[PDB]
Design a protein around this nucleic acid. Structure first.
Ligand SMILES: [Mg+2]
Lengths: 90, 76, 132, 62, 254
RNA sequence: GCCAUAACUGAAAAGGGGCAACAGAGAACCUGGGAUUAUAUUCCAAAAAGAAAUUGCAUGUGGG
RNA sequence: AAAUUGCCAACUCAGAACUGCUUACGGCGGGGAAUCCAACUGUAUAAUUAAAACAUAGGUUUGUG
RNA sequence: AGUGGUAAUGCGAAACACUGCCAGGUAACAAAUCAAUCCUCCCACGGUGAGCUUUCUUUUCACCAUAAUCCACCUUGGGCCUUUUACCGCGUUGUUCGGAGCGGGGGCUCAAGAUUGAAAAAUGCAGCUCUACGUACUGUUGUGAGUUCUGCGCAUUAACGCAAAAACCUGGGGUGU
């Protein structure tokens, strides 16, 4: 069946720590333990090892970046900026 | 300790200078020729009781033969 | 199509990993007791060393010896190169492998031909060692 | 230390250091990365000599 | 009458860093001739965690310029740095994420990290996890680059000082609540002895200027001068303004 | 033309010594004993009760 | 339809008649309605105070390129 | 101047001999789950001795041992090779895997054991029999329960990511040429 209503992974903590600090931690505890997309290897296999360290379980590629999610949204703003600025020099 | 396969290798070991004593152990099934050389103890397991006594006669001249018995506590 | 006899390959698997080899005979279709595509390779077991000025002859002549192998290898265990070595149509007729003594007498023949390519200086890429 | 070399190695290149799936991935890139530069080096000398008769052939045109 | 705890941490005895499980210092490779004129290429072999950082490290492998050897180089990584990447390093290096090239060569409006405040000191600015500097402008009369530091405080640096390109790795870290004093035990485990933090009002008057009384109150105003001696300079040191900041966001610093 | 043994010339090795762990690293021996009043994986002598492992150095035999 | 003939271990649960109780080792929460205070687990006056104190996560401020 | 096998990789009486320089690996570390080694406990087989017996008990209790070191090589967990290509399939108690090669068919290896032997019966123990720490003989199962040895890690909760070095090992390159 379905085991809890809306405390998902945070049911670990019981009736502790306040309702909303469990919810700010919930979006990032789900994110770091979810398997992300290996754009190198085509698979959904990036699991975070340590903080900022990700590893494709299919491709054995180790990617630095992002504490709780593989690519932080400030990175994709930077990757587009570098890609644009190397087109103006070629 | 090692183990001799054939009889052509047993007579080479008993010809050696380090071979102090061959100990002869009569099991109820086989016999054992335990050559005590300076590092290893070489054993030839002869399963046939008639071929065993023929092998004892070929190590007559100048190697020490010992009939292994059960030495009691009183010899000490 | 492109795996013609007389073509330099580089052996990618086995005890001869990374050695150059030329294709002698070729079998693109699989068969019983060798259920795979394959090629009779005649490669270099031991490359000739470099000689410098100062070395005497009988030191140059010993350092410039090629050693060969003559041996059937699966097609996925070598890597074909655009480079070629002119295996004539009359020379691979003299290379038998389906014997024990006519594989020894055919390995001395390949060793003599590669030595003649090496002393004449033809196809000097084939006699350079692949450094990985 | 007391064992033979064969319990600790294997008969090919980098034996006892690298495995079969990556001895070959170095043989393949020692050929393909050397030969890719030869394609780009010989393209470079073919370009500079075509420049050596794009303008030196303009000595007979004015 | 006794010495304040903040004065005692400068003896640095029980209060030094917890460095036994730390890797080496993370810095850029040596500004040699090979980067003043050309590029050195490396290759990323491993992405590493050391205790007491939130940003990922990286060992990059160069060849030594002068000897037949290879140099293991522990750099702090940007986001997107993968093992195998072939970092380039020097003057003629291109403009890509992970590369390290002088600030004169990086066109304006570009996010950079591991930027160095003087040429050669191997990276001193923008190294905490998720931080970056933005290049505002170049001046070719003076030969200096003016960039925006992660606090917003601008700083003009020489244009021969090099920088890596990217966000610092390991970003997004402070946005998750700790929830436990247990999780703050292990956060400060690989750093140094500075936790739990006892308030000054909870102390006796012998230990701290705020301590004592029958109610836990600071008696005097808690904004102390810049010229206060060590022991007296506790509280809000030289506060230009206090209170809940209602309005914009002033950059903090001199 | 390979060694190896004795005395001149000189490539190449940046970063001086020594401590700190009888619970970390490292470490070649195991039983039997009628062998004690008391010690033993420590003593046992030609059938070492015996079976080994290991280090240094040396002869001989054999191989390059 | 090996969908069935042979042989065999190690335990557990449920059901059923029949019969007895002197309620009979050891071990093992009393429960409920509210008010005050501190969110919580934790620390803490060795030798009279373990608390509502202290810590804590969380919140804010200040100094600093 | 080593050499077999398409290949995973094999072959050691003494040349498959040596190491300025280089690079790796070993030392070198990690939960819980399940499976679990030595060993312990129990049960089952029996043999020897002992204890109980008005009655009962094919009975109760004790014992039944095998050290290192070699040598030759049936399982059940890893890795892989080759051949058939499969994009639902294989598999775990369990959170998953596969065209970046699943599953079959043949293999190559590694790790933990099992087995035959040399040691080793000559030893050990308990009995007992004969004319003095004396002798001659007699005996040497288990789909049970517990076991961290192991499987086992790029291996735990983690804003926790889990020492180092000596010593050694293999390669690269060189010498032998
Ligand atoms: Mg475990």
């Amino acid at each position: 069946a379905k085991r809890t209503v809306k405390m998902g992974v945070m049911g670990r903590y019981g009736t502790r720590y306040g309702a909303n600090p469990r919810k700010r931690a919930k979006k990032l505890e789900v994110s770091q333990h979810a398997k992300h997309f290996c754009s190198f290897c085509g698979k959904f296999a990036f699991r975070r090892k340590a903080v900022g360290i990700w590893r494709c379980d299919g491709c054995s590629k180790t990617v630095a970046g992002g504490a709780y999610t593989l690519s932080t949204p400030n990175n994709s703003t930077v990757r587009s900026t570098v890609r644009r600025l190397r087109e103006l020099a070629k | 300790p090692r183990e001799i396969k054939t009889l052509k290798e047993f007579l080479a070991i008993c010809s050696r200078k380090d071979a102090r004593c061959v100990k002869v152990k009569h099991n109820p099934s086989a016999t054992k020729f335990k050559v005590r050389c300076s590092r290893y103890l070489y054993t030839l397991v002869v399963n046939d009781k008639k071929k065993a006594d023929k092998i004892e006669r070929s190590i007559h001249p100048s190697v020490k033969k010992i009939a292994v018995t059960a030495r009691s506590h009183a010899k000490t | 199509k492109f795996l013609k006899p007389g073509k330099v390959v580089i052996v990618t698997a086995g005890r001869y990993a990374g050695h150059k080899a030329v294709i002698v005979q070729n079998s693109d279709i699989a068969t019983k007791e060798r259920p795979y595509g394959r090629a009779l390779l005649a490669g270099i077991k031991k490359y000739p060393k470099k000689v410098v000025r100062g070395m005497s002859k009988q030191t140059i002549a010993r350092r410039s010896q090629v050693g060969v192998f003559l041996r059937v290898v699966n097609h996925k265990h070598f890597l074909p190169t655009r480079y070629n070595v002119d295996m004539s149509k009359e020379l691979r007729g003299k290379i038998n492998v389906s014997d024990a003594s006519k594989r020894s007498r055919s390995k001395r023949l390949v060793r003599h031909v590669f030595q003649a390519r090496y002393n004449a200086g033809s196809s000097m890429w084939f006699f350079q060692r692949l450094r990985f | 230390r007391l064992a033979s070399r064969h319990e600790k190695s294997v008969s090919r290149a980098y034996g006892g250091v690298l495995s079969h799936d990556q001895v070959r991935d170095r043989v393949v890139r020692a050929f393909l990365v050397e030969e890719q530069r030869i394609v780009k080096q010989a393209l470079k000398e073919h370009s500079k000599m075509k420049l050596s008769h794009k303008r030196t052939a303009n000595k007979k045109k004015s | 009458g006794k010495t304040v705890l903040s004065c005692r941490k400068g003896n640095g005895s029980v209060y030094q860093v917890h460095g036994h499980k730390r890797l080496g210092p993370a810095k850029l490779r040596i500004l040699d001739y090979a980067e003043r004129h050309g590029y050195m290429r490396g290759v990323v072999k491993s992405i590493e965690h050391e205790a007491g950082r939130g940003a990922a490290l990286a060992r990059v492998e160069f060849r030594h310029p002068y000897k037949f050897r290879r140099v293991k180089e522990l750099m702090v990584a940007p986001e997107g740095m993968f093992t195998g990447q072939s970092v380039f390093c020097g003057q003629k290096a291109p403009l890509a994420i992970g590369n390290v090239l002088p600030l004169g060569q990086i066109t304006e409006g570009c996010i950079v990290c591991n930027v160095e405040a003087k040429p050669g000191d191997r990276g001193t600015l923008a190294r905490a996890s998720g931080d970056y500097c933005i290049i505002i402008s170049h001046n070719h009369e003076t030969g200096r680059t003016r960039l925006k530091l992660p606090s917003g405080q601008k700083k003009s640096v020489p244009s021969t000082s090099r920088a890596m390109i990217g966000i610092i790795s390991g970003g997004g870290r402070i946005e998750k609540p700790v929830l436990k004093a247990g999780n703050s035990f292990y956060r400060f485990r690989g750093k140094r002895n500075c936790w739990p933090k006892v308030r000054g009002v909870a102390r006796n008057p012998v230990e701290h200027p705020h301590g004592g009384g029958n109610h836990q109150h600071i008696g005097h105003p808690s904004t102390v001068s810049r010229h206060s001696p060590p022991g007296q300079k506790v509280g809000l040191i030289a506060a230009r303004r206090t209170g809940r900041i209602r309005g914009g966001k002033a950059v903090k610093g001199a």
